[PDB]
Design a protein around this ligand. Structure first.
Ligand SMILES: Cc1cnncc1NC(=O)Cc1cccc(Cl)c1
Ligand SMILES: Cc1cnncc1NC(=O)Cc1cccc(Cl)c1
Lengths: 304, 304
């Protein structure tokens, strides 16, 4: 029992972290097999960042200008290429600590662990969700660029995120490992609008099921609702409209607790319309949306 | 910017995790140098746990009865000894992945990362605080015993906790790595009282300083207080009485923000007496006490 915002063990990702320096800019790289992945803004100076022409900037760089350091060993760069907003530096040495891995593009509302790094060194790990508006509310400082987001299925690391920037509002934006930004964001020092965000309804319901499993039950009521009635309340409160697909993925949780998904929806409706009344659920005084139904199943059953 | 409940990168601890089986009970062991540490209840059966005589139980066990498995390799047990509530199994092989490490006994209110494991496999990592009453509010299931709590200073892992049990109230109890329980707890299947808990005042103030650093400022007021006036409010709200030692460790945060500690105390006093008024601080609707002043400095400055 007990429910925590648990991150994946970051070990397989720590062995992949390197420091990449180009000119006077230092950031984090991800060394997998004989390739190092990093944000393409490693080639820019402060003045370049206002409106960079990356193709022009990269033309003035040679293999020897990219300094890649794996803690104490220096890697030899034998090739470089830009793919979208990432640079791929071919090294002459395959990383001995390369785990089994995949590059995946995650969906909004999905969750992942972030290994925050500075100068190629791991500082900490935390679990986060990709917001419906494609931003993440992380904890990133200058030097954290190139830190990655990932998920792990047994021995396979699915890299889903690489950190690129902090928006003027303090929220974060990055790309998948092919360098495509999540969201409308561009790697330029300009004010950029992040879309209207919503709360991830399915995750809040999964989190309500986790609370029932662990003993927090005061919010359960004698009511029920329909998807259409619930979605009118979700609309008023800026919650993602609930679909049958969401109801289907909540099935294992509904089955284990014996509380039908629309009955749980009715508890969420009363919580939205009346607040928590100065009470807590799994140590929180607000409705948590950073646990997917999958995350609740995994934690509640003890999957390693 | 941004503030997250960040855990230490768990890599150096994952390389130390092993599975320990004795008879029909399986749990987690910690392999450091040529010694494996695990809870002593690995030698008990369900019937034994009601009132175990550990010395008697251990006498019927030989080196060959302790099965220690490091993933795929089997370790050869050449000695066994009980120290308080832990068993130390001497193996003939020093763990090649042993990091630089220390065994430390932490103080109540201090924080650490927990690497939850099942059958010697790491499932996830999360940050937690040792409650003033010596319990932890973790996320532990059957099989998690022997999972450890730790802190990391550059290349040194300070092991501070080993998980032993779940109290009837769903809260957790364990020992330091010398097998001494934190708190009055005993490794027996009996109902055991955990003392009255309090909120870690110094950590809540550190967390208020983190909120100021990251932009959440609405709670700052035109008031001030004294340690004596503040402690009367801390008494009414079951907060740990603030001392000059706590005021001294908040110094770096007070210095960086320019908000005197007693001025921050006055903000906390108004928050305790008036609640959050349906607002949030660093994404929380309650007063967070799981970040020490040290944790705030480290995260806010980017220490790896
Ligand atoms: C300062 C900072 C803090 N946290 N995370 C990232 C940070 N760095 C940047 O955002 C630098 C940068 C500027 C403009 C565009 C891009 Cl792609 C990158
Ligand atoms: C079931 C469980 C869940 N979470 N964490 C630990 C768990 N196991 C136990 O507490 C087993 C046990 C019983 C009595 C005394 C001791 Cl020392 C240990």
């Amino acid at each position: 029992s007990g429910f925590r915002k648990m991150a994946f063990p970051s070990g397989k990702v720590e062995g992949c972290m390197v420091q990449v320096t180009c000119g006077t800019t230092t950031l984090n790289g991800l060394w997998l097999d004989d390739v190092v992945y990093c944000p393409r803004h490693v080639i820019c100076t402060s003045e370049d960042m206002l409106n960079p022409n990356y193709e022009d900037l990269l033309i003035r760089k040679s293999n020897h200008n990219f300094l890649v350091q794996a803690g104490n060993v220096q890697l030899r760069v034998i090739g470089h290429s830009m793919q979208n907003c990432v640079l791929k530096l071919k090294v002459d040495t395959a990383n001995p600590k390369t785990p089994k891995y995949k590059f995946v593009r995650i969906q909004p509302g999905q969750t992942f662990s972030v290994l925050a790094c500075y100068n190629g060194s791991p500082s900490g790990v935390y679990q986060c969700a990709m917001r419906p508006n494609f931003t993440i509310k992380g904890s990133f400082l200058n030097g954290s660029c190139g830190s990655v987001g990932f998920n792990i299925d047994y021995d396979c690391v699915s890299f889903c995120y690489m950190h690129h920037m902090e928006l003027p509002t303090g929220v974060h934006a990055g790309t998948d490992l092919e360098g495509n930004f999540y969201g409308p964001f561009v790697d330029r020092q300009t004010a950029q609008a992040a879309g209207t965000d919503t709360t991830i309804t399915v995750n809040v319901l999964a989190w309500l099921y986790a609370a029932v499993i662990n003993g927090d039950r005061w919010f359960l009521n004698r009511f029920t609702t329909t998807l259409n009635d619930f979605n009118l309340v979700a609309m008023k409160y800026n919650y993602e409209p609930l679909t049958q697909d969401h109801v289907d993925i909540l099935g294992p949780l509904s089955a284990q607790t014996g509380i039908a998904v629309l009955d749980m929806c009715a508890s969420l409706k009363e919580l939205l319309q009346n607040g928590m009344n100065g009470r807590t659920i799994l140590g929180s005084a607000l409705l948590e949306d950073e646990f997917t139904p999958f995350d609740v199943v995994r934690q509640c059953s003890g999957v390693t």
